[PDB]
């Protein structure tokens, strides 16, 4: 589930919103078995912050 | 007419009764210091450890 992915990889259960936002997927909808997903890193989430 | 620097270990009575409104009397010291009222210009209480 997205909760497990947010917990294992991001260390926070409410971080799942990022993962879905990183994949354009509606969480209420079904994810087929064998479908690929993209999970953000913890240490590599800070370089998505653009400073200007 | 005289200046006195007193650095000493703080006690409770040395905390409540040592204010610039009191008159200091130092005993067991030099004769010209004993028996005279010393006006406290200032008091400082430092705490670096226990």
């Amino acid at each position: 589930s997205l909760n497990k992915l947010a917990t294992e990889y991001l260390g926070d259960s409410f971080a799942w919103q990022i993962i879905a936002d990183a994949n354009g997927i509606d969480p209420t909808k079904e994810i087929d078995i064998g479908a690929g997903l993209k999970v953000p890193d913890q240490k590599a989430l800070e370089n998505s912050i653009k400073k200007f | 007419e005289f200046q006195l620097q007193l650095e000493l270990h703080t006690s409770q009575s040395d905390l409540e009764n040592l204010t610039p409104d009191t008159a200091l009397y130092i005993e067991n010291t030099l004769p010209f210091i004993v028996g005279k009222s010393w006006f406290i210009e200032s008091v400082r209480h430092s705490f670096s450890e226990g």
């Binding site: 909760n3 497990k4 917990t7 259960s13 | -």
Partner: protein, 113 residues
């Protein structure tokens, strides 16, 4: 306050004013939840290892004891493990409520449900 096990008694949630039975309910809640069962806090809960050979069966006892001490600070916990015959590992958690000095009997247990 409401104690852990949700029971509708006399049309309402069981409401208790004695903190010893509330602590007992908290112990039951902690032991009845495993890490990864709660969503808000996926880390709270006892660690469960069920299908494994019985060699390091004291480590989980120690982990459960430590978790009980950290989560519940109003009670003292001592956890012991015994090996039964077929596949059963019998855990015994001795707990005492620091608020009381004597063993406190609860009347809800005597009631027949």
């Amino acid at each position: 306050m409401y104690v852990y096990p949700p029971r509708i008694i006399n049309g309402t949630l069981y409401k208790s004013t004695d903190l010893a039975e509330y602590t007992r309910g908290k112990i039951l809640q902690t032991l009845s939840i495993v890490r990864g069962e709660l969503v808000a806090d996926p880390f709270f809960g006892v660690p469960l290892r069920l299908f494994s050979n019985i060699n390091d069966y004291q480590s989980d006892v120690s982990k459960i004891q430590i978790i009980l001490e950290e989560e519940i600070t109003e009670a003292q916990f001592i956890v012991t493990g015994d090996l039964k015959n077929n596949g059963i590992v019998s855990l015994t958690v001795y707990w005492a409520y620091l608020g009381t000095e004597n063993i406190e009997n609860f009347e809800i247990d005597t009631s027949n449900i």
